[PDB]
Amino acid sequence: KTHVQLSLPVLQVRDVLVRGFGDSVEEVLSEARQHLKDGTCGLVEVEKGVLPQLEQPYVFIKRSDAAPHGHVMVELVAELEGIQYGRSGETLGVLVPHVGEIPVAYRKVLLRK
């Protein structure tokens, strides 16, 4: 399928144990996609002070379109030293590995895969 319905645990930035997916734009997009497929991906909502507490390169979920079945349609965009790889809409947040942190909410998305 070109899209997959996912329910992503929303994590507080200070609870996150593994604060990024790797060391290159291509690696972080790859790992983010593997973790999304394996159900081991969390979401951190971006506010003042969040990104400096996470590791670059960043993987964002961005709105790809305007929402089936309550799931916002999203795609992945990476960012390294102020350059983005991908073009999309509003940031829903930054993806991180999930290793059992307790979420504050779940965010339903339809991921372009």
For this PDB entry, the determination method is: X-ray
What resolution, expressed in A, was reported for this entry?
A: 1.7
SS3 13: helix
Between vectors from CA 99 to CA 96 and to CA 101, what angle results, nearest 5°?
Answer: 90
- Please count the structural domains in the chain: 1
> In terms of residue numbers, what domain contains 107?
3-112
**3-class DSSP string for 18-83:** CCCCCCCHHHHHHHHHHHHHHCCEEEECCCCCCHHHCCCCEEEEEECCCCHHHCEEEEEEEEECCE
Name, in order, each residue with C-beta under 8 angstroms of 58's C-beta and a sequence gap of 6 or more. 20, 28, 51, 78, 79, 80, 94
**Cα-based torsion angle of the residue sequence 39, 37, 16, 56 in order, rounded to the nearest 10 degrees:** 180
Q: What's at 70, amino acid-wise?
A: G
> Residue 92's domain is classified under what CATH number?
2.30.30
